Design a protein around this ligand. Sequence first.
Ligand SMILES: CCCCCCCCCCCCCCCC(=O)O
Ligand SMILES: CCCCCCCCCCCCCCCC(=O)O
Length: 129
Amino acid sequence: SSFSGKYQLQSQENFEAFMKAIGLPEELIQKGKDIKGVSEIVQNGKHFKFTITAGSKVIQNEFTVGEECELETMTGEKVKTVVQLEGDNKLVTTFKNIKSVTELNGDIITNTMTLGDIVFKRISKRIGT
Ligand SMILES: CCCCCCCCCCCCCCCC(=O)O
Ligand SMILES: CCCCCCCCCCCCCCCC(=O)O
């Protein structure tokens, strides 16, 4: 259960440019750019559930490491992909040409999404249990 916990965004880089590019409606990005979203992760071996909450926006996802999964993304688009572990603390996947890396270091989770030259980075911090 390496990843299990509740974390809240501390800061992020390139939100507006990234979200605009991927098709997030401008009302959503203006509403969301300064929201400190909360991510809740439950890991049980290879099985993950996660919930991302940003204001009124609640996205729930699940996947099994190394298997095909269906992820609901920022816009609502559901994509078929595979999420892999690279060691106990790093989740890596790709969808819509975006590379997503989620890495836990103690209580800090860093998520990096790369689309072409755009690197959207989020840093979150554990908040309680
Ligand atoms: C009126 C409230 C609505 C606010 C709209 C929120 C728009 C932001 C949507 C993107 C949130 C998900 C991004 C995090 C994904 C990740 O890095 O793992
Ligand atoms: C909008 C969801 C996109 C899916 C992103 C990759 C899925 C595998 C990693 C899921 C762990 C969730 C960690 C979120 C970290 C954060 O909120 O910045």
